[PDB]
C-alpha cells in the first residue's frame, strides 16, 4: 500500500571515510557537506569526482554542525543542540548572519519559498528565508502513524526526501499533508561500496541536482557517494 522503491547505482564516487555526514546538498557542479571530523564541525565544498575538499571552514568548538542547504547566494546550516543557525556566503564561506530557533537541528533543505528543517521528531519546520523563523509545520505520518527520526533532507521533484535515522530507508513526504507517499530502500547498498572502513556509520545524506535530475545518497564515514535512479518495486 505504501509504494517501495529500489535503487540502481548509476555512478559511485569516493567519499571521505572519516567524515560524519550531517548535511549534504548539490550545487554548481559541487557537493556541499556538513561534516563532523573528530568532534569538530566543518562545512565543506567537495569535488564530486575525487571526493576531495576544495574548501572548508571550521565551526567553533562549542557548535555541533548539522543540516545545510543553499539559499540563493548562501549556505544555511543548523546546529545539533545550540539553537543557533548560520548563514554563509556560498562563495567565500564567510559568516554573515546567525539566528536562533528552538529544539534540535537535524536536517535542512528548501523549496522555492522556504527553508525546511527536521529535528529527529515527526514534525518538519518551514522557515521564512528572511526572518528565519517557522511559518508552517507539518507532521509526518506513515500508514497514519507519526514517523520520528527524520534526519538529512532533500527536496526532490515536489517532495521532501528524508533519511530516517538508523534505518536504511529514505521516505518521500508529501509537503502538503506530511504523508509518506513512498519509501526508498537502500538496504544492502553498502555491499556495493567497495572495501569498508573501520569504523563505518549510518546512511545519511541526500543531494539532488534539479537541472539533470541526479540523486546522490551517502552516509556517515561511507567510502562512496552513490548516484542512484529509482525503480518502483514489483
CA distance 140 to 64: 25
Nearer to Ca ion, 25 or 63 (CB): 25
Closest residue to Ca ion in the complex (CB): 154
Under the binding rule (CB under 5 A), the answer on residue 63 touching Ca ion is no
Backbone angles phi, psi at 189, to 5 degrees: -65, -25
CA distance 185 to 202: 14
Would you report the helix, strand and coil content of the chain in percent, each value rounded to 5? Answer: 0, 55, 40
Residue 39 preceded by cis peptide, ω within 30: no
Q: Which stretch binds Ca ion (CB under 5 A): 22-30, 89-97, 125-133, 217-225?
A: 22-30
Q: Which of residues 92-131 bind Ca ion (CB under 5 A)?
A: none
Q: Is 62 helix (H, G, I), strand (E, B) or coil?
A: coil
Supply the minimum distance, in Å, between the C-beta of residue 222 and Ca ion. 15
Binds Ca ion (CB under 5 A): choice among 154, 156, 204, 228: 154
Binds Ca ion (CB under 5 A): choice among 13, 20, 25, 63: 25
Q: Which residues contact Ca ion (rule: CB under 5 A)?
A: 24-25, 154, 206
Amino acid at each position: 500500500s505504501i509504494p517501495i522503491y529500489d535503487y540502481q547505482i548509476v555512478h559511485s564516487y569516493p567519499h571521505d571515510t572519516k567524515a560524519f555526514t550531517e548535511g549534504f546538498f548539490y550545487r554548481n557542479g559541487y557537493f556541499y557537506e556538513s561534516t563532523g571530523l573528530n568532534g569538530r564541525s566543518s562545512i565543506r565544498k567537495v569535488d564530486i569526482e575525487s571526493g576531495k575538499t576544495l574548501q572548508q571552514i571550521e565551526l567553533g568548538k562549542r557548535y555541533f554542525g548539522e543540516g545545510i542547504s543553499d539559499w540563493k547566494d548562501k549556505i544555511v546550516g543548523l546546529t545539533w543542540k545550540n539553537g543557533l543557525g548560520f548563514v554563509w556566503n556560498i562563495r567565500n564561506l564567510r559568516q554573515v548572519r546567525s539566528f536562533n530557533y528552538d529544539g534540535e537541528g537535524w536536517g535542512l533543505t528548501h523549496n522555492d519559498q522556504y527553508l525546511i528543517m527536521s529535528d529527529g521528531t515527526p514534525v518538519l519546520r518551514f522557515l521564512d528565508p528572511e526572518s528565519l523563523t517557522p511559518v508552517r509545520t507539518i507532521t509526518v505520518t506513515a500508514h497514519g502513524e507519526e514517523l520520528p527520526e527524520l534526519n538529512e533532507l532533500e527536496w526532490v521533484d515536489g517532495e521532501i526526501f528524508a533519511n530516517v535515522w538508523q534505518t536504511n530507508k529514505i521516505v518521500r513526504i508529501d509537503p502538503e499533508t506530511g504523508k509518506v507517499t513512498g519509501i526508498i530502500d537502500l538496504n544492502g547498498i553498502l555491499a556495493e561500496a567497495g572495501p569498508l572502513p573501520s569504523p563505518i556509520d549510518v546512511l545519511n545524506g541526500i543531494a539532488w541536482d534539479k537541472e539533470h535530475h541526479r540523486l546522490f545518497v551517502t552516509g556517515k564515514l561511507w567510502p562512496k557517494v552513490f548516484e542512484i535512479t529509482l525503480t518502483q518495486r514489483v
